[PDB]
Design an enzyme around this catalytic site. Structure first.
Site, PDB file in Angstrom:
ATOM      1  N   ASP A  39      16.530 100.962   7.656  1.00  0.00           N
ATOM      2  CA  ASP A  39      17.371 101.262   8.804  1.00  0.00           C
ATOM      3  C   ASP A  39      18.426 102.355   8.642  1.00  0.00           C
ATOM      4  O   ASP A  39      19.257 102.547   9.547  1.00  0.00           O
ATOM      5  CB  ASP A  39      18.037  99.965   9.319  1.00  0.00           C
ATOM      6  CG  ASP A  39      18.989  99.336   8.307  1.00  0.00           C
ATOM      7  OD1 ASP A  39      19.474 100.038   7.394  1.00  0.00           O
ATOM      8  OD2 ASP A  39      19.261  98.126   8.430  1.00  0.00           O
TER       9      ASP A  39
ATOM     10  N   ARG B  88      22.319 105.307  11.046  1.00  0.00           N
ATOM     11  CA  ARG B  88      22.051 103.883  10.936  1.00  0.00           C
ATOM     12  C   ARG B  88      21.511 103.472  12.312  1.00  0.00           C
ATOM     13  O   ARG B  88      22.075 103.834  13.346  1.00  0.00           O
ATOM     14  CB  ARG B  88      23.356 103.127  10.616  1.00  0.00           C
ATOM     15  CG  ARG B  88      23.260 101.588  10.613  1.00  0.00           C
ATOM     16  CD  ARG B  88      22.379 101.073   9.461  1.00  0.00           C
ATOM     17  NE  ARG B  88      22.441  99.618   9.303  1.00  0.00           N
ATOM     18  CZ  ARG B  88      21.919  98.735  10.158  1.00  0.00           C
ATOM     19  NH1 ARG B  88      21.286  99.142  11.255  1.00  0.00           N
ATOM     20  NH2 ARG B  88      22.042  97.432   9.928  1.00  0.00           N
TER      21      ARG B  88
ATOM     22  N   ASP C 147      18.751  95.117  11.845  1.00  0.00           N
ATOM     23  CA  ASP C 147      19.024  94.979  10.439  1.00  0.00           C
ATOM     24  C   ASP C 147      17.747  94.715   9.675  1.00  0.00           C
ATOM     25  O   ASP C 147      17.120  93.686   9.871  1.00  0.00           O
ATOM     26  CB  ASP C 147      19.997  93.847  10.152  1.00  0.00           C
ATOM     27  CG  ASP C 147      20.422  93.817   8.692  1.00  0.00           C
ATOM     28  OD1 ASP C 147      20.548  94.898   8.069  1.00  0.00           O
ATOM     29  OD2 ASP C 147      20.614  92.721   8.149  1.00  0.00           O
ATOM     30  N   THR C 148      17.315  95.695   8.883  1.00  0.00           N
ATOM     31  CA  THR C 148      16.151  95.518   8.034  1.00  0.00           C
ATOM     32  C   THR C 148      16.757  94.943   6.756  1.00  0.00           C
ATOM     33  O   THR C 148      17.956  95.169   6.475  1.00  0.00           O
ATOM     34  CB  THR C 148      15.498  96.839   7.705  1.00  0.00           C
ATOM     35  OG1 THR C 148      16.483  97.731   7.172  1.00  0.00           O
ATOM     36  CG2 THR C 148      14.880  97.445   8.947  1.00  0.00           C
TER      37      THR C 148
ATOM     38  N   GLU D 144      17.993  94.216   2.935  1.00  0.00           N
ATOM     39  CA  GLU D 144      18.651  95.007   1.908  1.00  0.00           C
ATOM     40  C   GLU D 144      17.794  95.290   0.687  1.00  0.00           C
ATOM     41  O   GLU D 144      16.965  94.474   0.288  1.00  0.00           O
ATOM     42  CB  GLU D 144      19.937  94.288   1.477  1.00  0.00           C
ATOM     43  CG  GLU D 144      20.849  95.087   0.550  1.00  0.00           C
ATOM     44  CD  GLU D 144      21.408  96.330   1.215  1.00  0.00           C
ATOM     45  OE1 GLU D 144      22.001  96.213   2.316  1.00  0.00           O
ATOM     46  OE2 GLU D 144      21.245  97.425   0.635  1.00  0.00           O
TER      47      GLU D 144
ATOM     48  N   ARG E 256      28.637 106.784   9.598  1.00  0.00           N
ATOM     49  CA  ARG E 256      27.207 106.950   9.903  1.00  0.00           C
ATOM     50  C   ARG E 256      26.973 107.014  11.410  1.00  0.00           C
ATOM     51  O   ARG E 256      27.543 106.215  12.155  1.00  0.00           O
ATOM     52  CB  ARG E 256      26.375 105.784   9.342  1.00  0.00           C
ATOM     53  CG  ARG E 256      26.476 105.571   7.838  1.00  0.00           C
ATOM     54  CD  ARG E 256      25.624 104.384   7.376  1.00  0.00           C
ATOM     55  NE  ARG E 256      26.103 103.126   7.944  1.00  0.00           N
ATOM     56  CZ  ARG E 256      25.680 101.918   7.587  1.00  0.00           C
ATOM     57  NH1 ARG E 256      24.756 101.775   6.645  1.00  0.00           N
ATOM     58  NH2 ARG E 256      26.184 100.845   8.186  1.00  0.00           N
TER      59      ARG E 256
HETATM   60  C1  LIG Z   1      24.318  98.726  13.096  1.00  0.00           C
HETATM   61  C2  LIG Z   1      25.845  98.773  12.790  1.00  0.00           C
HETATM   62  C3  LIG Z   1      26.379  98.468  11.608  1.00  0.00           C
HETATM   63  N1  LIG Z   1      27.746  98.259  11.458  1.00  0.00           N
HETATM   64  C4  LIG Z   1      28.381  97.791  10.190  1.00  0.00           C
HETATM   65  C5  LIG Z   1      28.514  96.324  10.141  1.00  0.00           C
HETATM   66  C6  LIG Z   1      28.392  96.048   8.649  1.00  0.00           C
HETATM   67  O1  LIG Z   1      29.664  96.292   7.999  1.00  0.00           O
HETATM   68  P1  LIG Z   1      29.937  95.660   6.545  1.00  0.00           P
HETATM   69  O2  LIG Z   1      29.270  96.499   5.551  1.00  0.00           O
HETATM   70  O3  LIG Z   1      31.393  95.747   6.509  1.00  0.00           O
HETATM   71  O4  LIG Z   1      29.372  94.321   6.690  1.00  0.00           O
HETATM   72  C7  LIG Z   1      27.359  97.088   8.140  1.00  0.00           C
HETATM   73  C8  LIG Z   1      25.859  96.687   8.144  1.00  0.00           C
HETATM   74  O5  LIG Z   1      25.028  97.812   7.781  1.00  0.00           O
HETATM   75  P2  LIG Z   1      23.920  97.726   6.645  1.00  0.00           P
HETATM   76  O6  LIG Z   1      22.795  96.880   7.149  1.00  0.00           O
HETATM   77  O7  LIG Z   1      23.520  99.134   6.463  1.00  0.00           O
HETATM   78  O8  LIG Z   1      24.583  97.087   5.511  1.00  0.00           O
HETATM   79  O9  LIG Z   1      27.584  98.180   9.044  1.00  0.00           O
HETATM   80  C9  LIG Z   1      28.629  98.665  12.393  1.00  0.00           C
HETATM   81  O10 LIG Z   1      29.818  98.822  12.152  1.00  0.00           O
HETATM   82  N2  LIG Z   1      28.100  99.011  13.586  1.00  0.00           N
HETATM   83  C10 LIG Z   1      26.754  99.072  13.884  1.00  0.00           C
HETATM   84  O11 LIG Z   1      26.412  99.345  15.033  1.00  0.00           O
HETATM   85 CA   LIG Z   2      20.215  96.715   6.620  1.00  0.00          CA
END
Ligand SMILES: Cc1cn([C@H]2C[C@H](OP(=O)(O)O)[C@@H](COP(=O)(O)O)O2)c(=O)[nH]c1=O
Ligand SMILES: [Ca+2]
Length: 135
Positions: free
Chosen positions: A15, A29, A34-35, A37, A81
């Protein structure tokens, strides 16, 4: 919403990717999903994470054209991102992953949830077919 052209630089995982947008390189992103980790040790290599990466990777490596579509709210997350619905030859990557049971609908933050129901309906189908994450 409006689609805009972008150029693939490097697919990172299921993702997240690096794209050239508006002349500048930046990591993107996928919105609403959410794919699993494959990087952060805190989560480790979760089930289907590698599978999702490979699916996203194939899908976008053979695309003639890539387009990014921002939602109506903020365009970047706290990590800087870009947040978008990304299309590979008119096919939404965000939706394709969910339809395959390689991603769950997640991080639904108003007002960046325009295609939420569409993705919800494809996740429901993947669930009923017991696909991957739902197997
Ligand atoms: C998809 C997305 C992710 N996020 C944030 C939430 C999560 O923060 P935290 O890292 O603080 O948990 C993280 C998840 O992305 P990843 O799946 O790339 O980890 O990115 C946003 O802020 N907005 C969004 O629209
Ligand atoms: Ca992810």
């Amino acid at each position: 919403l409006h689609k805009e052209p972008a150029t693939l630089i490097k697919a990172i995982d299921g993702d997240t990717c690096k794209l050239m947008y508006k002349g500048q390189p930046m990591t993107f992103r996928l919105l609403l999903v959410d794919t699993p980790e494959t990087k952060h040790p805190k989560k480790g290599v979760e089930k289907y994470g590698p599978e999702a990466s490979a699916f996203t990777k194939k899908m976008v490596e053979n695309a003639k054209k890539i387009e990014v579509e921002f939602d109506k709210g903020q365009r970047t997350d706290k990590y800087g991102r870009g947040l978008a619905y990304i299309y590979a030859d008119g096919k939404m990557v965000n939706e394709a992953l969910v339809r395959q049971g390689l991603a769950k609908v997640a991080y639904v933050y108003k007002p960046n949830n325009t295609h939420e129901q569409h993705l919800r309906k494809s996740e429901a189908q993947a669930k009923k077919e017991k696909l991957n994450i739902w197997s």
